[PDB]
Amino acid sequence: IKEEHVIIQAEFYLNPDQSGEFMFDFDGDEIFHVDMAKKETVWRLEEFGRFASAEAQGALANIAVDKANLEIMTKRSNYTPITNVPPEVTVLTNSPVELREPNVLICFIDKFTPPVVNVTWLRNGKPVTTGVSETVFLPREDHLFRKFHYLPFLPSTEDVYDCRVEHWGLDEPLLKHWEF
Amino acid sequence: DTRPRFLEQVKHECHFFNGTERVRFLDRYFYHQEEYVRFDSDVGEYRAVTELGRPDAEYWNSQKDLLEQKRAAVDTYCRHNYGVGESFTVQRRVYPEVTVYPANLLVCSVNGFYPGSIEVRWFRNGQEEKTGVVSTGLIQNGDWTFQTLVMLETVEVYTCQVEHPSLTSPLTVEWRA
């Protein structure tokens, strides 16, 4: 019935934040995005960059067009703003958890728009701001977004974790809890 | 920050059927979530969706240079990129790791595999259990790996069997009561 594979070059521009994104998606996973600050291709896995190249400059040119189209489309809509859609948040591990055996906490932030969040990992209520990582905003088929944040950790009986999420669709920050 | 937001999205989509034998190209334009125009290779011109795209439909469809560009995209864009990416995407294979433990529910935790296509089967004394199976379904980890937790309601040898494109033959993990 259905295709074997989809490749999507997904772009967005958001006003008034002036946030652009340009990324390639293969069956739901990111191949790469362009870092709009460094103006650079960022490969989701390092080895992709040994297998292929992308000229970041072409993506910056598309983003300029997207922002001009946006302003044109903002006027054509009579300034119909976006309706905030608050995210669903789930915390899981990469693998079965064993005490003192390295693992990774995944904070999955799903089905939300617009593509702006503040995400903090909390270990025993304290921010973890080194040795964490995140994805850009990944496109959904319903044209909402998802995103992933990661925390490598050593499972312990003594520690508790929260993924804290702020988004304009929520009334307060959302804490999603994990503990052994 | 209370100020109203305005979002433009563009999705250049390549759909591949039977490798590259059949390819569909969509250029899709979105205001917030609202697809307002698209180019469907199968259609061969721009069509206004939520008719905020009316201007763009006409103006773009009146630039016959653009159309031959877009009509060619299934070759110049889609089939090209498929070729570039094939080796590390279409052909990417990473083995599942399988762990069985009591949560009773007997958990078959299947982790770190690519691609997403997988069959996870529970056997009790060598017979497939077709009831009492509580599954997560496929979980995308966002790092080109998947997991799934497939739990069997139990009250003997229990074996979890995994089939996956990465494997030459089924992976089995046994739990003896």
């Binding site: 000229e55 040119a61 189209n69 044109i72 | 570039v84």
Partner: peptide, 13 residues
Amino acid sequence: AGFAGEQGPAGEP
């Protein structure tokens, strides 16, 4: 080998 990015047209004011 290089991925090709697809360009888009400017819209109608």
